[PDB]
Design a protein around this ligand. Sequence first.
Ligand SMILES: O=C(O)[C@@H](O)C(O)[C@H](O)C(=O)O
Ligand SMILES: O=C(O)[C@@H](O)C(O)[C@H](O)C(=O)O
Ligand SMILES: O=C(O)[C@@H](O)C(O)[C@H](O)C(=O)O
Ligand SMILES: [Cl-]
Ligand SMILES: [Zn+2]
Ligand SMILES: [Zn+2]
Ligand SMILES: [Zn+2]
Ligand SMILES: [Zn+2]
Lengths: 410, 410, 410, 142
Amino acid sequence: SREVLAEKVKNAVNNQPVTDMHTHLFSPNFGEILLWDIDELLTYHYLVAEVMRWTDVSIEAFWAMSKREQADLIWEELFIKRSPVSEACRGVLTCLQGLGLDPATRDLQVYREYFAKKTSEEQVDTVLQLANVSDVVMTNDPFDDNERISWLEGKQPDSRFHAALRLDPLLNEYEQTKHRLRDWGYKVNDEWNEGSIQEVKRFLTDWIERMDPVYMAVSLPPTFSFPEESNRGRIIRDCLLPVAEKHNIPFAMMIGVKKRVHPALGDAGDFVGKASMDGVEHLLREYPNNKFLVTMLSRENQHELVVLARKFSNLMIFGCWWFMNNPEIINEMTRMRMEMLGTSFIPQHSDARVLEQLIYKWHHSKSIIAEVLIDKYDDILQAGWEVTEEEIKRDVADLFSRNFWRFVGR
Amino acid sequence: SREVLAEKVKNAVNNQPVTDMHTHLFSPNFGEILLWDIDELLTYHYLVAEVMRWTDVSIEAFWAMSKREQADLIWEELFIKRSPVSEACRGVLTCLQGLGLDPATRDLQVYREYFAKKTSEEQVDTVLQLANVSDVVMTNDPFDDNERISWLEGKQPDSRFHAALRLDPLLNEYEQTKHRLRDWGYKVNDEWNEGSIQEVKRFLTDWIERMDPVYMAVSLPPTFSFPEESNRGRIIRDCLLPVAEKHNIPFAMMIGVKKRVHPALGDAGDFVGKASMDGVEHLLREYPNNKFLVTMLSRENQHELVVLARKFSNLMIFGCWWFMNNPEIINEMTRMRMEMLGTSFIPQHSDARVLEQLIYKWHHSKSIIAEVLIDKYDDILQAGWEVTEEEIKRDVADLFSRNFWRFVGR
Amino acid sequence: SREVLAEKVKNAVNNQPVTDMHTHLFSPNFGEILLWDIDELLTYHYLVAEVMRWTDVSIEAFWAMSKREQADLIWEELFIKRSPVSEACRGVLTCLQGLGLDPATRDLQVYREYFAKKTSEEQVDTVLQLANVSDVVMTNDPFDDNERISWLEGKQPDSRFHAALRLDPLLNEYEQTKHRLRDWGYKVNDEWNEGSIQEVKRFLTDWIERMDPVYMAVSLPPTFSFPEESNRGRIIRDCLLPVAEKHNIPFAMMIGVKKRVHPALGDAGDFVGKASMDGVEHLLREYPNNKFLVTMLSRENQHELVVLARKFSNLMIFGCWWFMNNPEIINEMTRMRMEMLGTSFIPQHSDARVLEQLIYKWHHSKSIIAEVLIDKYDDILQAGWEVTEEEIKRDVADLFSRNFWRFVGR
Amino acid sequence: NDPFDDNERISWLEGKQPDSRFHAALRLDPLLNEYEQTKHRLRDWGYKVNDEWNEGSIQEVKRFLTDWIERMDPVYMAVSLPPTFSFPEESNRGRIIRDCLLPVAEKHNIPFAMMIGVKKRVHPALGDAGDFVGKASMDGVE
Ligand SMILES: O=C(O)[C@@H](O)C(O)[C@H](O)C(=O)O
Ligand SMILES: O=C(O)[C@@H](O)C(O)[C@H](O)C(=O)O
Ligand SMILES: O=C(O)[C@@H](O)C(O)[C@H](O)C(=O)O
Ligand SMILES: [Cl-]
Ligand SMILES: [Zn+2]
Ligand SMILES: [Zn+2]
Ligand SMILES: [Zn+2]
Ligand SMILES: [Zn+2]
């Protein structure tokens, strides 16, 4: 029956240890960059954008408040003055309950008590256990002063944390970044010649050696195109692709983000745009020895992206990114994906910026993926097919963990 | 439980008095422009387009028939020859049943009897009571000869009816409209100079003074862009925006309509197109002291529009407009909206052209919005949150009425 | 009640004989072009694309394998190593069960036994009976050497099979095709003059005379536009349209296919793109005496296509084509269509390349269409409308068969 | 000297050497501007170019150029181009120039002559007198 299947699917999904292949979390020993707290959860930029639609407090005043005050404002405006029904607000409550706290009391002061008596290491153990996350993939930007520090000091991340070499500044801001490269000893010239090419490669190789990243990544605008006689186009073609092939490291492209449409909002000021599939199509076909992990921001790019994955095996689609990370969208995306790709895709990643988010991000997404799995297994069951519990666990393992590790070559 | 919640949500939704912030209805005392009748309901242009896909009667012959004959044809073709399953046909039946008539008999002659013995004022009282609509926002075009009359005669609308200054002819047909402005005493010159600017402002100010509109509005094509060195671009930049800021009146933009692709169909001859978000993005960011009410016609513009609202608080999204006003779409739009905006948006408007439509428009939309509210409240309930009935009524009040009045400054 | 209605709708839908207005099947007497077998089902290009996302076997090696080996590989990779949850894999199982075979045993060798002891004619009788398909519309390309043979030999197709004149080579590859036309006696000149025009018309007329097609068809790219001073634009304008009007034959346009993005994949190497609606809009309005059957490949073209059908009665929308032929999409498309068009559209076609697919294609689509019909009938039932079983059968007959025959003029 | 012209191929294939006052120039219009049609002739001549632009197609096109350079000993390779000429470009012309012509020309130190601006056959019936002209962008040459 469907209910017998349902229980097996839900059990398999809930018990399957998750490999979160894209987050903004950091190994505890890396320091304060690792954000956690009910205060951090409430000041997540997703909620900053949401509170600004309600509060009379200016954005300037908001940025001038302490994190405690910002959190108090957001709690009052989005949870008390109006029901916390949005996905992000729902997420906060899910994290609280998961930690054993009681959302029924709406006692923020009591919730804060829970966090103030623990250490980073302890909360990490707690959260990964609760979220059943075995591996976390970080976003490591060698262009950030704070992050560069731990890496240069020789600090190695926790074994549960993996590095990913983020290259946004290099690919999207070369004109400014080239100068920093020079200061660091990478002799790139004013013009794109053999010298500049080799030094950029040396730069990538040095960080690959230092981080041992599972992949190199970059977020791109709606106008992204390739090939292109631009700094980005040339760097990707002459340096990134060749280096990635040599070390058999996949290239992750997060396409569709239009940066800073509302500067004053900070991290909450980015917009979205539909991109052309031409560049991705070209990269996949012309670089068969390169591997590509892709996720797009526009709802209107989702279906064609699935179709492109049917064309090229060197393409691995992943997650329901940012503005796509909402139940209604996650549901439609996951169903279209399983329908045209079976289980050859990575349904989700958390993109967690605050440690505790791993709880709600995976909880909310797992229940949806579980329902989709139940429908699909049931359809073949009605066709006379018999699926074993072991086959279910196998499929679930591919979706939440094995597809990623298998694609990156680990 | 979910069923206890369901009843509370449905009750709150059904009892919440509605402020319909965009319709094509008129205060009864305004005259015959106020359309009502089972005949008017059946000759709604939405059904004209639908009947032309079935009937062998030429469009010319149709326009030559009396309204009674047109209604008879549409009833026969869309209700008798085929089941009235489309949204618009379903709407007609909902209006009948709501009025106490019986769709089971399919007796159009009997239905007509009900309307012929009442007055405009009486039917208005009846419908607003049935639809539980407390306030109706009109669309008042000072460029229409018939409408200009009541306003110039000094006629004030019923207290339940509010004015909205529609400016399509001014913004999209200035080359022709400028001449009428001159005939009315507004000395606009051949070239866009201080004189033309001031006289256009004087024109807007005079009508704002006469109508006391809750907002100024315009429908725009898929190709809409801003800024732009065109009559529209210049009028918006040099006159509309400044005047709207001074009187703190919001600017409503209904984007995506491609006018007259099938001229012979009349009001049923408009098409749709996806628009670029650039112009809206620019307006929101560069005019922070101006308020904007926006609704778009293309299904492919919906998600990005929600994201843009997360960026700018001077943007208030509203309704599921025209071709978007169908269950399947209303559902997906409302869910995406609540998920990314919580309750900071106006889910719907009727766009009613015929008085009785208020019944089905709100009935059909309320049941969908109610189901979405139930899902979202249930999700936070499962997270341990407890929502009171008063909080539900508060949220419902914001969605169906308070968000609008609060945004316009009333 | 809804369950009483449900049974009537499901019964009507299941019993309604289907006219499949677009397939890639052939009358049995046409020869081996008629594909059938569990081996053919498994080597369907939809599954080739899917297996290439999993298998380590090179595409070259795959094309070098025998059909038996290809089928074995696909069965092992997509059904045994991972659960066959994708739509195409689900389809294979549905066909097996429908034929009386047992998917529970996963015994491919036993399944093969069933097919090896029957004749084409026998399997055709079997499948059409099982799929309850009364009429099959073929895709007949006079430019294919193999197909041209039966037609030139004077072979007439089975009475259950209808011809459709496919013109892709003529319209999209005229520069190469013109030479073949000359070799066949059609004196087209180097330049587009009266001579070339008349000879192209003569060519179309000759094949219309030989095939007696229900319609002429062509698949078009995302960049399709009209009018256009190109071979395609000129051929459509000066030859196709005039000839189609004269014989009152509709023109079918399948828009949105980007051919060969992955050449090595063969038939599995096509991609998709969103098209502009301008060309279709122009054709519908400027050629009122011509009939057009249209289906588009991009998910983002679906809603506007429905709106365009509301504008022009000479437009008949049909099916959920190729990448659109997935439950999640079929559901949303069918609901948007019924909501804005009632029953004036053709919900589906199979596009079957392998005989047995008629079973799963129609089985999977019928259950979805049935659920949509049940919702819509229920909505008007709740409005007080009473629908008779005969009206249901009538509506179902229009959707699955009469709308097509009525539109083509048969 | 157009190796794609039947009449012209003869003398070269027969081993005929031109008068000492006459020098050869390898004209490549058919190769660069009509590859889709020309590729088939290359195949018939033994140059195994594939359907897709890969190492194989590249090497065989180079072999073709090298063979004729060897046979003609041209002072330069030449081509006439349309007003819309651009470079780089993901087209047959753009790829052939980038992956074959330029490399081969550098190796043998042979210059590349480009005669830009001709819009072919605007008046077909006039034959050789049917070509028109158009202003080109300097971007590709630059
Ligand atoms: O929080 C987010 O998802 C964004 O602000 C970014 O971190 C984005 O996911 C990125 O990786 O660029
Ligand atoms: O009936 C309609 O919705 C349209 O014909 C128009 O009234 C549109 O809503 C508009 O306001 O321009
Ligand atoms: O199998 C398919 O649907 C495609 O490969 C084509 O046959 C397409 O449907 C077409 O008719 O061009
Ligand atoms: Cl789109
Ligand atoms: Zn991220
Ligand atoms: Zn309106
Ligand atoms: Zn949906
Ligand atoms: Zn087909």
